[PDB]
Amino acid sequence: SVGGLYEIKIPTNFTIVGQEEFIQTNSPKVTIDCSLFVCSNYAACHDL
């Protein structure tokens, strides 16, 4: 500080800048038919 004053760079002109941001609030609702995935329609697999 020279004589009680500091050197500072103060803006003399400005613009407005845009910045997009994506926040994920949802996801595909995946549903699985567990018996049909594992065994399809085969009776011996369903029994096991």
Partner 1 sequence: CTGGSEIRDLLCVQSFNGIKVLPPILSESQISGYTTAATVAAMFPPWSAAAGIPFSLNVQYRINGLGVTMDVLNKNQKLIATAFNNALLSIQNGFS
Partner 2 sequence: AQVQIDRLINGRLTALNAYVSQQLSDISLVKFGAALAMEKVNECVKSQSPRINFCGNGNHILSLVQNAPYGLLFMHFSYKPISFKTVLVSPGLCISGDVGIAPKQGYFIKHNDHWMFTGSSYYYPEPISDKNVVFMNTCSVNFTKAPLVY
Neighbours of 23 (CB within 10 A): 4
Considering the complex, what minimum distance in angstroms separates the CB of residue 1 from partner 2?
Answer: 8
Residue 17 Cβ vs partner 1, minimum distance, rounded to whole Å: 18
- Half-sphere exposure of residue 13: CA atoms within 13 angstroms, side-chain side: 0
User: Do the Cβ atoms of 31 and 24 come closer than 8 Å?
Assistant: no
Residue closer to partner 2, measured from CB, 5 or 41? 5
Site string for partner 2, 1-40 (x = CB under 8 A): xxxxxxxxxxxxxxxxxxxxxxxxxxxx-x-x-x--xxx-
Provide the binding-site residues for partner 1, judged by CB under 8 A: 6-9
